[model samples]
Target chain A: VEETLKRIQSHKGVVGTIVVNNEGIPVKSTLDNTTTVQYAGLMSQLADKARSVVRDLDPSNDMTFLRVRSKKHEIMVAPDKDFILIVIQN
Target chain B: LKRIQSHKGVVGTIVVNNEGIPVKSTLDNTTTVQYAGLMSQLADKARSVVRDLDPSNDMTFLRVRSKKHEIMVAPDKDFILIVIQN
Candidate 1:
């Protein structure tokens, strides 16, 4: 998991990477301590909400990729049964 | 529209509402309908497959590569975005 985080962090413009479990606990991270903890929880919650929204629209539907681009940074979130991967790029 | 079109390697993009009707697109009328329907169906199946494994989870991105093209699907609450690339 550390190697995977490092590989993602080495990508050009990638600010950091964090892996968080379903309960929002950070399992591994290459981001600042505070950022990792803070975002680990928020990202998990956000992904859950997004999932609900998608399912509400179509009961049989699901998400595949999500990207939020801001002026200074871009955030991507990938989720599975037990974990979520968050990537920050600037 | 120009901004999205200017992205390199993005052959075309079609935005379809939840009802599967094309709201906006840069492709020809026929191609727009064809891709919008096909991509939406593919995304629905992908979502269901993942949700079956993790009922508490959701999908945010999906990609499919074929012999000559790649399809990217982004499903949102109000619409679905399908990008065709070569």
Candidate 2:
């Protein structure tokens, strides 16, 4: 829960972290007001789309990880059957 | 190619240069060519999407697995590496 999120935030370069349910609602987070809401929505949609596309390519396929990096930061999304963890680092 | 082909679970490996032409491979010729193209094409699409998020972004690794096979695609500035496993 919050302890897990705090542990993740303690990692090197980690700026924020969010845990979202399978329905894409934020359950817990340590991000700022703007970042928490923005990523709560974007990360889940991006992950869902990526998962669906990969599944369409092979119906039996499941996504294990998805990461996007920019010049300023990196975002990683990991999904399980019931929830997803999003980590933001800079 | 020899090194990877000897690894456990590795079914095939293909290396394609920046031009999208296979330079070396241990896979069936037809399948090798087809997958080489697809992997590069998909990588390009993936690169585009990631770049849109930030123009300075770059993609370093990509992987897709199916029920019967696993495909790992890695794209670089000059070439693409594709590994197929079962």
Candidate 3:
């Protein structure tokens, strides 16, 4: 997990990376602490909400990725039942 | 709500309470319930994402652009407005 996260942040334009568990705990992160519990905890819920939206829409379908576009950067998230990967890029 | 629906490309409008129950909707019953529950949940999570990302900041709106349509949500205390665009 450490090696993969390092590699992901090493890529051009990749600003930061975070790996959160299903419990909404930020297990790994490349950026400075954002209150520690803030991004990891809330972000996990955010990703789960996105995932549930798709399932609620269609039982057979699922949401695999969610992306946020803001003025400063773009936040992309990929979530499964086990873990969620959140990445920031410019 | 009618005013919003009458606008161009505006498909439907839903008003949900804090509990995520649809109180009023221009769409059909099944679709309205789906949007009410799911969208409200997403909206709450989105609000927190913004809230925690910036403790002093708040979220005014949330837009989800998908392959087929777009969902725009306006949230207020105890009430949420969900709009779908085609």
Candidate 4:
């Protein structure tokens, strides 16, 4: 887990990395103290939303990616097996 | 993503889903991506204009400076990703 996170952390836009179960429980993470447990909850929210979107768009297509943007920031989420790839930056 | 940020006038950028998770972004702090204060309000305004104008795929999202930094959000897929410049 540490090595995986280290590889992800080496990237430019990656501030931190979190490995969570499909149920949204954190297994491993590298976030700074400024972040909170609430982020884990947010990840769960995203996981549920992503799966639901794909479920809704089924039969013809599957949602492979999604993004959200704010004033000085952006978030990208990708499906990884039963996990997720969440990248954040500002 | 850093390459996008180096573009002139681009302050920052990110792509996320409805649940507010960060997938990718270019800015000083990744943690701040999910918390950007101006996007929701800005995108709401741009959405009104887009609905009236009937934006096309070739139309890139953009925001201009008149009084404050303007904003635009366009679809990458189901959601309109926000972009800011100037």
For the predicted complex of model 2, DockQ is 0.19
Please say which candidate is ahead in lDDT: 1 or 4: 1
Model 4 misplacement above 4 A: A2-4, A32-36, B1-86
In model 4 chain A, where is the ten-residue run with the lowest total lDDT? A50-59
lDDT of 2 by residue, A4-29 (tens): 67778889999878888877778888
Q: Report model 2's interface C-alpha RMSD after superposition on the true interface residues.
A: 4.4
Leading candidate by TM-score? 2
lDDT tens per residue, model 1, A1-90: 665667888899998788887777888887778767766665565556556545543456665545544334556778745778888787
Clashes (backbone N, CA, C under 3 Å), per candidate, total 8, 0, 0, 17
Question: Candidate 1's chain A scores what TM-score?
Answer: 0.85
Would you list the C-alpha lDDT of every candidate in the order shown?
Answer: 0.69, 0.72, 0.74, 0.49
Q: With candidate 1 superimposed using the best TM-score fit, by how many Å does residue A74's alpha carbon deviate from the native? A: 0.3
Q: A20 in model 4: Cα distance from truth in Å?
A: 1.2
Positional deviation of B40 in candidate 1, in angstroms?
Answer: 20
Ranked candidates, highest TM-score first: 2, 3, 1, 4
Clashes of 4: 17
The superposed Cα distance between candidate 1 and the true structure at residue B19, in angstroms, equals 22
Tens-digit lDDT track of model 3 for B26-66: 88999998888788778767866775686666667666655
Question: How does each model score on TM-score?
Answer: 0.51, 0.62, 0.58, 0.44
Chain B TM-scores across candidates: 0.91, 0.88, 0.89, 0.47
The complex in candidate 3 yields a DockQ of 0.21
Candidate 3 RMSD computed on C-alpha atoms after optimal superposition onto the true structure? 5.4
Q: In terms of lDDT, which candidate is stronger, 2 or 4?
A: 2
Question: Which one is best on DockQ?
Answer: 3
What fraction of the true Cα-Cα contacts (under 8 Å, chains A to B) does candidate 2 also have? 0.08
